[PDB]
Design an enzyme around this catalytic site. Sequence first.
Site, short mmCIF file in Angstrom:
data_model
loop_
_atom_site.label_atom_id
_atom_site.label_comp_id
_atom_site.label_asym_id
_atom_site.label_seq_id
_atom_site.Cartn_x
_atom_site.Cartn_y
_atom_site.Cartn_z
N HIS B 41 0.82 -1.23 0.00
CA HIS B 41 0.00 0.00 0.00
C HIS B 41 0.85 1.28 0.00
O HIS B 41 0.30 2.38 -0.03
CB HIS B 41 -1.09 0.00 1.07
CG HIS B 41 -0.62 0.21 2.47
ND1 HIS B 41 -0.51 -0.84 3.34
CD2 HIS B 41 -0.31 1.35 3.12
CE1 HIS B 41 -0.08 -0.33 4.49
NE2 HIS B 41 0.05 1.00 4.40
N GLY B 143 2.40 5.77 9.76
CA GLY B 143 3.76 5.60 9.24
C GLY B 143 4.48 4.35 9.74
O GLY B 143 5.60 4.08 9.30
N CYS B 145 3.75 1.19 9.22
CA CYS B 145 3.75 0.07 8.28
C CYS B 145 5.12 -0.25 7.72
O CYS B 145 5.91 0.66 7.48
CB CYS B 145 2.72 0.30 7.19
SG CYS B 145 1.05 0.24 7.82
#
Lengths: 302, 302
Positions: B41, B143, B145
Amino acid sequence: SGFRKMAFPSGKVEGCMVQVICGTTTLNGLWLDDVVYCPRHVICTSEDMLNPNYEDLLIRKSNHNFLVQAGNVQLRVIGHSMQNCVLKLKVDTANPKTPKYKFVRIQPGQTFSVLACYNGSPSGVYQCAMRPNFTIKGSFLNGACGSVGFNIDYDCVSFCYMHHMELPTGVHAGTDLEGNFYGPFVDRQTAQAAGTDTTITVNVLAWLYAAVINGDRWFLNRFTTTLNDFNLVAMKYNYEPLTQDHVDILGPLSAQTGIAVLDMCASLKELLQNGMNGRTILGSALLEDEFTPFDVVRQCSG
Amino acid sequence: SGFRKMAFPSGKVEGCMVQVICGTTTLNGLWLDDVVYCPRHVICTSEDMLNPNYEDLLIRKSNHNFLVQAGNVQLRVIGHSMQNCVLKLKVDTANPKTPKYKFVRIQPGQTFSVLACYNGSPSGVYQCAMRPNFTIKGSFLNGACGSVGFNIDYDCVSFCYMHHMELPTGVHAGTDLEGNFYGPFVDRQTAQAAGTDTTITVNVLAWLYAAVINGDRWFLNRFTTTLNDFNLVAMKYNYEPLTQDHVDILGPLSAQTGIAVLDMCASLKELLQNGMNGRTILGSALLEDEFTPFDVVRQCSG
Ligand SMILES: *C(=N)[C@H](C[C@@H]1CCNC1=O)NC(=O)[C@@H]1[C@@H]2[C@H](CN1C(=O)[C@@H](NC(=O)C(F)(F)F)C(C)(C)C)C2(C)C
Ligand SMILES: *C(=N)[C@H](C[C@@H]1CCNC1=O)NC(=O)[C@@H]1[C@@H]2[C@H](CN1C(=O)[C@@H](NC(=O)C(F)(F)F)C(C)(C)C)C2(C)C
């Protein structure tokens, strides 16, 4: 979201751990530039630890009696000295992994990460608070001495603790990196006990702000209190007095949530007087005091 | 002595963290040899995340659209591919800090350390159990991820998790390093909920052995039980069935303490039926299920 007890990334400290052997005693050392710092009881036999004269034991050791190993490399000891309860071993090689660092003496109520080590090898990391009785609730087995506690501020490692001993109830005691113990302890194997501990009020308040930020707000009452009335009530529950310095340090969390510190004090007062009625706060059935206002800000705003 | 939730030393993983930016989306990547792994993503805008067609979004990206930074060095992307929910970015430089590693798919009930990162920079480390509902109770902000979970076995890092999303109740979900999610989750911003969780029985037993080793033995009763009768009783308290494989895995703790697993099962049965009567076990007022038998052995024997 979520709130967890979190340690600092330990890499910068892992690169400083070495094994120190003196005769048949082995423990951990911290190698920074060309100096290795370690608990002075590395020079004791089991018998000496009962009532040691460190100055006498050290005069009969030369540099070659200290064997320092960093991974698969033996470091040559070229100087030695004792500073309070730590030995400093000058080595012929500066640690190229030395991070930016400082030695700090932490205050009671503050937290730090512990890198537990055995034989110069890091095994695990966890967070501790320096209790008001100058002990930490750690987890250390035989050979853990010389493991250090630290904080990391941007690129700088502030070393604040070096492990020396375990007290009754499974609590731990040690020194700063200048070898001065936290608390009235001595590095001798004789009956010693920690004083009665107290709950770190400002940290419980910080953790209640963490709970609000995470959506656990059931304990928020509609009242306020004065600092004096809060401290009169909280004294009976063995909570430290909350000072104006503590109220100032809680300011960022108070401003972020829009909950005044004295309003959170009124909510804590009700929790102390009435209990939690079987309910939890951030999954805990007890009030937690091992997270500082900074620890909370670190996780609940970034 | 002492028993604490302990993470693995994170140094080996810190040396693999990088920042990955694609357009205006930034997250963390794991750089091992000449490959950077990150959540797919990173190629989405906020709008795309509502209902993304990753295959379509990726066909319109070239290598130069991915900016990878490792400290103060920009790594040049020279290849890309998507494997399930992860993107693999081939870079022109192999990470010289790549530890010995493997990618593993962990089982529910097992634990791992999480190195939470932001902008390619490690911020903290903590231990998680993969719940039976395939979520973890983590602590992650925007942030995070691309932060990874791992275990360390001697010198080898077994990476088992990469962070992708947060579910209702503040729980977290992610994939293995081959990009397959744990649980029935998808990387789309749409209403998703974890299934009802269960208590990891074998871990509660492991933590009761940890308590005995630490001197907290009040809960030990004088009875034994059969595995069938233990599982009949424990089902109503939403405890996982204890299998013979779990009993075998508890063998080392049982042999160390001289307490048979089925005798500890009789003690746990009494604790489930009668409660803890206001008492604590290892300082906790609740039974803990996030320590595996290995985690306990690691701390209560070395
Ligand atoms: C350093 N490697 C060990 C770490 C200890 C071992 C068990 N868990 C730990 O934290 N430090 C020691 O063995 C020190 C050391 C002599 C004795 N000692 C103790 O920790 C002992 N404690 C005390 O005598 C007491 F209570 F006063 F703190 C022990 C009974 C072994 C736990 C010296 C020089 C203090
Ligand atoms: C990665 N950097 C973040 C980490 C999130 C941010 C808040 N705490 C975390 O763990 N991941 C995301 O923002 C992912 C990402 C889109 C939306 N998302 C979510 O985590 C959302 N959750 C869901 O939509 C749900 F419930 F289905 F899991 C959010 C509501 C923002 C928490 C994608 C592509 C899934």
